[PDB]
Amino acid sequence: MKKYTCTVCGYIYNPEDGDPDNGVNPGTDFKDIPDDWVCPACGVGKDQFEEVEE
Template sequence: MNESVAARWECSVCWTVYDPAEGDDVAQIAPGTPFQTLPDDWRCPHCDGPKLKFMRIDDDR
């Protein structure tokens, strides 16, 4: 995975992190799914916040 595809994103409502390496069990999103390819109607699995409320996390992993 390149850097942008592997980037993690954090919900600005509840601080839940979407990690593409893990996917999202709640929405049945497979591991390895980049944030950019999530459906537009995807919601935060913790607080139900919309996708547009997520911010990219710039971190070193």
């Protein structure tokens, strides 16, 4: 799975770690994260994230 970054603050969503405190378990692909989730560091919506191509 690929990492995704918040294009507003730079936070990186890493699918191997998820965002468990906000209900996203490790191993969740960004696309499957419920669409009302927001960046844990600045609060903007998932629509401000972009795939990090490796």
